[PDB]
Amino acid sequence: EVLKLHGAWPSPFSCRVIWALKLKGIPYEYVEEDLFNKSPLLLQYNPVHKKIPVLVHGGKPICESTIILEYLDETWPENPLLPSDPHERAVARFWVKFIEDKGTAIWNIFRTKGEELEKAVKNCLEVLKTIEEHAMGVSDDKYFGGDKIGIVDIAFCGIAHWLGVIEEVAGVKVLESQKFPRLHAWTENFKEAPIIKENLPDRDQMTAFFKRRREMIL
Amino acid sequence: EVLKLHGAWPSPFSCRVIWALKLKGIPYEYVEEDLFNKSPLLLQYNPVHKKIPVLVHGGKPICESTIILEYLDETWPENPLLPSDPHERAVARFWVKFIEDKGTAIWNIFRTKGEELEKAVKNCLEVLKTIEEHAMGVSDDKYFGGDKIGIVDIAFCGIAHWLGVIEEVAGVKVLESQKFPRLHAWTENFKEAPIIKENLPDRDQMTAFFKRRREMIL
Numbered sequence: 001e002v003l004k005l006h007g008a009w010p011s012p013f014s015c016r017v018i019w020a021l022k023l024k025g026i027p028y029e030y031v032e033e034d035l036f037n038k039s040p041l042l043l044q045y046n047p048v049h050k051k052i053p054v055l056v057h058g059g060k061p062i063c064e065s066t067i068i069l070e071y072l073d074e075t076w077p078e079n080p081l082l083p084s085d086p087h088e089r090a091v092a093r094f095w096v097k098f099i100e101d102k103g104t105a106i107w108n109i110f111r112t113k114g115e116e117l118e119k120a121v122k123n124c125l126e127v128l129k130t131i132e133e134h135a136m137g138v139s140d141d142k143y144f145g146g147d148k149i150g151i152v153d154i155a156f157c158g159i160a161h162w163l164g165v166i167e168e169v170a171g172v173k174v175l176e177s178q179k180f181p182r183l184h185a186w187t188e189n190f191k192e193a194p195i196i197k198e199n200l201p202d203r204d205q206m207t208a209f210f211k212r213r214r215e216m217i218l
Numbered sequence: 219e220v221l222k223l224h225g226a227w228p229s230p231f232s233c234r235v236i237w238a239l240k241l242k243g244i245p246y247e248y249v250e251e252d253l254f255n256k257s258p259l260l261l262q263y264n265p266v267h268k269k270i271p272v273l274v275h276g277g278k279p280i281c282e283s284t285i286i287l288e289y290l291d292e293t294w295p296e297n298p299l300l301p302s303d304p305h306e307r308a309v310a311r312f313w314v315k316f317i318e319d320k321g322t323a324i325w326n327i328f329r330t331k332g333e334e335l336e337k338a339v340k341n342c343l344e345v346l347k348t349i350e351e352h353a354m355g356v357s358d359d360k361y362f363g364g365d366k367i368g369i370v371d372i373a374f375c376g377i378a379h380w381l382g383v384i385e386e387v388a389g390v391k392v393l394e395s396q397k398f399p400r401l402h403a404w405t406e407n408f409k410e411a412p413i414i415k416e417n418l419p420d421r422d423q424m425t426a427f428f429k430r431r432r433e434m435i436l
Binding site for chain 2: 087
């Protein structure tokens with residue numbers, strides 16, 4: 001069955017799926033989708049939200065990055081992203097949903113100035129604090145998945161890699177190592193992981209790309 | 219292992235779990251939680267959102283109604299709420315997430331008047347239209363789960379039962395049978411299902427309860 005991933009190179013959400021595919025070593029064909037002028041296939045595949053990623057297996061589309069990750073686990077069980085224990089799965093699903101629900105708190109820094117910027121920074125700091133204080137282990141593990149990358153690690157990839165770009169692009173500091181030390185350590189450990197590291201879109205290049213987009217929003 | 223469900227009787231979210239427990243016939247102890255002055259257990263169990271439902275198994279809490287439903291399926295596989303096929307599970311998960319993301323569109327009618335009410339009715343109609351046009355089967359099935367109740371049926375229970383109360387309480391019409399005929403048929407079939415029917419909180423009583431709460435918000 002032909003497997004195609006429709007994505008966009010600077011999207012954290014598309015990158016989640018790239019990572020998940022690469023951690024399992026599943027072959028796929030990648031398709032870049034323009035987001036200003038959308039393709040007929042994107043609109044056919046995702047009539048409800050019209051967003052990437054879409055994973056298409058045997059011509060059948062699956063929308064939503066988090067839902068795609070679960071589908072990958074069910075169809076290719078080797079190297080699970082989900083914990084095996086049902087209680088632990090439930091807690092991991094909680095943090096995936098949480099970051100889905102709060103993810104705007106990253107992206108609002110990106111597109112605001114002045115006093116609405118000062119407010120977005122405030123909302124973002126509360127999300128980070130909640131993760132720092134409630135989501136991190138009772139354990140000595142590197143990753144939310146233990147000694148290997150799991151679904152919460154992937155779901156938090158925005159925090160690990162995109163927030164720092166967006167901070168620099170908006171001219172603010174948010175995720176400071178001394179404030180969120182456990183989350184900070186995790187970001188460094190995540191990005192230094194094999195497979196993650198080799199598939200991180202270039203920081204400096206994303207920074208220039210988002211710099212351009214921010215100006216042309218302000 | 220002792221199983222306790224912390225809930226509130228008029229909550230659609232608590233009722234999801236009641237239904238799921240009852241469809242599988244899992245014994246549990248129910249605990250009503252006040253929502254104005256929250257208990258220390260609720261706050262201990264759900265420090266992040268401080269909301270019901272919480273399911274507590276062997277003293278270990280699980281938050282989020284949708285996540286609880288998945289936990290029930292994994293721990294008591296008899297009478298699955300999830301489709302077995304991974305593609306079909308993925309599509310069901312999509313609509314569960316969708317109603318989670320859009321669920322405010324019910325609850326904003328409940329707490330608005332005048333022109334913000336007229337706007338909430340408009341937002342709600344677009345959600346209903348999206349479901350009517352994209353979520354309903356290519357099939358002759360009664361339920362989103364087929365010939366039996368599944369996770370999408372439960373997730374949509376707000377639409378089936380609470381919206382009609384909230385419409386009447388706010389003095390508006392939204393879900394009109396002639397506009398959303400397939401979704402309308404589904405609401406009637408859902409509510410007439412054994413186990414669902416015997417566990418629907420009383421309409422007239424919810425109506426008076428929410429009437430009271432709306433006044434004391436306006």
